[PDB]
Amino acid sequence: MKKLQIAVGIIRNENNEIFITRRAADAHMANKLEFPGGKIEMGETPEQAVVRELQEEVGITPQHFSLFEKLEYEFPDRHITLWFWLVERWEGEPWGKEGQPGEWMSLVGLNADDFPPANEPVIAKLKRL
Ligand SMILES: Nc1ncnc2c1ncn2[C@@H]1O[C@H](COP(=O)(O)CP(=O)(O)OP(=O)(O)O)[C@@H](O)[C@H]1O
Ligand code: CON
Numbered sequence: 001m002k003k004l005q006i007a008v009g010i011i012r013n014e015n016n017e018i019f020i021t022r023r024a025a026d027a028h029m030a031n032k033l034e035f036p037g038g039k040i041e042m043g044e045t046p047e048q049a050v051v052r053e054l055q056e057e058v059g060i061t062p063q064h065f066s067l068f069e070k071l072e073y074e075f076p077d078r079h080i081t082l083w084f085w086l087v088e089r090w091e092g093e094p095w096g097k098e099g100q101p102g103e104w105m106s107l108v109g110l111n112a113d114d115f116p117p118a119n120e121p122v123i124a125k126l127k128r129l
């Protein structure tokens with residue numbers, strides 16, 4: 001009976017290096033690629049919302065955010081959303097990981113093979129990148 005959106009917007013920028021939570025510790029698996037949440041709500045548009053949710057987390061400036069696409073996972077009583085504002089040129093350090101680690105990830109044109117099926121609706125598009 002509620003709804004919420006997430007102004008994450010992965011941030012690939014070395015070639016396709018996103019600041020995604022990439023198993024900081026050496027993991028035996030490789031599907032630990034979630035998405036730097038942030039919760040869009042500030043202002044009243046995915047711009048001031050994600051952009052302001054961008055600085056409020058780390059504290060950089062650039063990043064050249066871009067929509068690219070977004071999903072909407074529906075739950076029994078949880079209407080969630082997840083704006084994927086993909087950026088590609090942050091200053092020195094990135095900025096987006098919510099309560100997650102968020103770390104540069106040398107993936108290479110995402111494939112969804114390293115990302116969990118949970119965010120299937122958007123990971124399907126990264127696959128194309
Ligand atoms: N993909 C997802 N699946 C399920 N729940 C999600 C989700 N993305 C976000 N949520 C949940 O929905 C809540 C959104 O409410 P908000 O309080 O507006 C977030 P927030 O506290 O403003 O931002 P924050 O993400 O920086 O903590 C989050 O606390 C999160 O737990
Ligand atoms: N910005 Co929050 N209140 N679920 N940590």
Ligand SMILES: [Mg+2]
Pocket residue numbers: 037038039053056057098
């Ligand atoms: Mg936030």
